[PDB]
Amino acid sequence: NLAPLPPHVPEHLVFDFDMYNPSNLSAGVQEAWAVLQESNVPDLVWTRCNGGHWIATRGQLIREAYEDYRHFSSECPFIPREAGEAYDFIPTSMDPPEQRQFRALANQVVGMPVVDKLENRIQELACSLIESLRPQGQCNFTEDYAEPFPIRIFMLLAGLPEEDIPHLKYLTDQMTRPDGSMTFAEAKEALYDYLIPIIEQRRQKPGTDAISIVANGQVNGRPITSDEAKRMCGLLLVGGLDTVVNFLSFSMEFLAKSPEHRQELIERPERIPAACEELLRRFSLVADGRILTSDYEFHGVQLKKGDQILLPQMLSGLDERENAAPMHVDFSRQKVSHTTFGHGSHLCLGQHLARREIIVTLKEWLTRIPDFSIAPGAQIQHKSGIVSGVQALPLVWDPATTKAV
C-alpha cells in the first residue's frame, strides 16, 4: 500500500522501497537494501511505503544528515511515524544540546572502563554457552547462543537477578519483534512497568550497578528524574540485544558458508579484531532516521518540515563510493569505512562492549568448534526493518573435530 505522493516530492525521485519487506529479501537482506545503490537510483529518494518517507542511499548523505541535528531531528527517529512518535527512550529520542549530558551519563555505565571490568564475565559466558553446545554437533546458533548472550551480559551490568531473564526477554521481544497484537506504545509501557519499581528501589537504596548509577545521576545542572532514568534504562536494556544477536548471526552464517574465511581466522587468530571490523561493515544491520525540523534544501532536493528521512546506517559501508568491491568480504581490507554504529552526536555508546562481545565470541567459537556448516538443505531466512536480522541459523559439526575447553 502506497501513501499519496506529497505535492512537493517530484516523480523522478520516487522509488517504492519497503524497509520491512524489501523485494530481494530471500537473496540476503544487505543485498536487498543495496538495490538502492544501483546506478539509476538517486542519492536521495522518496518511497511511498510505510507512510511515505525519504531515504538517503549513499554514505556521504547519510553521514551529513546524521551530523546536522538542527535540521534532522531524533524526536521521531523511526518509520512508521506512529512508532517514531511514541518512542521516548533517552538519549535516542533527544537532540543536542539537551542530549549531550544524558549521553555522558549513559557513557558511565556502558563505555570503555566498564568494558574491561566485564571482560571476564563475557569470556566466561561465551565459554559456558559454547561448551554446552559443543558435543551436540548441532545448534540453532541464533536461539542457542546469540539470544542468551547479550541479555545475560546486561543483567550483570544492571545488577538484575538471573531469574528475571525469561520475563525480561519476553518483554523486550514483545517490543522489538512485534507481531501486531500490541501497539508500539503498549509494548513500551509493559517494559516500563518492569523498570519503574526497580528505579524506585534503587533511588532509595542505591548500589553500584548501572541502574543505580543512572537513576541517581546528575544531568544538565540537576538530578535526573525517575521518568528520565526509566527512559534511559529502557534504551540501555534494548540497545545491546537485537543488534548483537542479529549481527552475530549474520557473522556466523557467513563463516559457516565460507570455509576459507574460517580457516583464515583459525590459522591467523590475531586477524580476528580486523575481521570483526570488516564483518561490521559487510553485515551492517541498523536503519533508523530523523524528522525534518523545518523546510530545507538538501543536495538539491526540497525537504518539508515534518518529512521523515530514513538514514540507513547499513548503507554507508556497502556504498561502492566508500569501499571498493563492497559485497566482497576481505579481512585484509585497508580502509574499512562504515557507519554500522551510527554517526554524529548519537554514535553508539555500546560500540566497545559490542566489539568485545563479537571478538570474544569469534575467538572462543573458532577454537572450540573450528569446523561447522549450515545444516544441509536449510535455507537461511533474513528479516528486514529497523534492526535487520536472521530468523534461525541451524549449524552442524562433527563433535570429533571439536576441542573440549
Ligand X SMILES: O=C(CCCC[C@@H]1SC[C@@H]2NC(=O)N[C@@H]21)NCCCOCCOCCOCCCNC(=O)CCCC(=O)NCCCCCCCCNC(=O)[C@]12C[C@H]3C[C@H](C[C@H](C3)C1)C2
Cell of 46: 522518496
| C-alpha–C-alpha distance, residues 131 and 155, integer Å | 21
Task: Give the DSSP H/E element, type plus range, for residue 79.
Answer: none
Other CB atoms within a 10 A radius of the CB of residue 359 amount to 16
Residue 340 interacting entry, from ligand X, ligand HEM, K ion, none, C-beta within 5 to 8 Å by type:
ligand HEM
Q: Which stretch binds ligand HEM (CB under 6 A): 103-111, 115-123, 160-168, 328-336?
A: 103-111
Query: Could you tell me where the DSSP H helices lie in 70-218?
Result: 81-86, 99-110, 112-133, 141, 148-158, 165-176, 184-204, 210-215
Contacts of 100 (CB under 8 A, 6+ apart): 345
Position among 237, 286, 301, 314 found at the interface with ligand X (CB under 6 A): 286
Position among 54, 89, 145, 283 found at the interface with ligand X (CB under 6 A): 89
- Mark whether 243 is an active-site residue: yes
Angle of CA points 225, 105, 202, to nearest 5°: 50
Other CB atoms within a 10 A radius of the CB of residue 115 amount to 18
Region 14-33 residues binding ligand X, contact defined as CB under 6 A: 20
313 near ligand HEM (CB under 6 A): yes
Contact at 8 Å (CB) between 397 and 138?
Answer: yes
* Cell 559457516, residue located: 256
Catalytic residue among 125, 348, 353, 395: 348
76 annotated to bind ligand: no
**Is residue 45 classed as helix, strand or coil in its secondary structure?**
strand
Region 329-358 residues binding ligand HEM, contact defined as CB under 6 A: 340-342, 346, 348-350, 353-354
What is the DSSP secondary-structure string of 139-180? EEHIIIIITHHHHHHHHHHHT--GGGHHHHHHHHHHHHS--S
Position among 44, 56, 110, 366 found at the interface with ligand HEM (CB under 6 A): 110
Q: For residue 223, how far is the Cα from the chain centroid?
A: 30
Closest residue to bound ligand HEM by CB = 350
# residues near ligand X by CB under 6 A: 18
Q: Which stretch binds ligand X (CB under 6 A): 4-12, 53-61, 175-183, 351-359?
A: 175-183
Region 38-97 residues binding K ion, contact defined as CB under 5 A: 87, 93
> For the chain, how far is it from start to end, CA to CA, in angstroms?
53
Catalytic residue among 2, 70, 177, 398: 177
Binding site for ligand HEM (CB under 6 A): 74, 77, 91-92, 99, 103, 106, 110, 235-236, 239-240, 243-244, 247, 286, 288, 313, 340-342, 346, 348-350, 353-354
Which residues are known to be catalytic?
Answer: 177, 242-243, 348-350
Binding site for ligand X (CB under 6 A): 20, 80, 83, 89, 92, 175-176, 178, 184, 235, 238-239, 243, 286, 288, 385-387
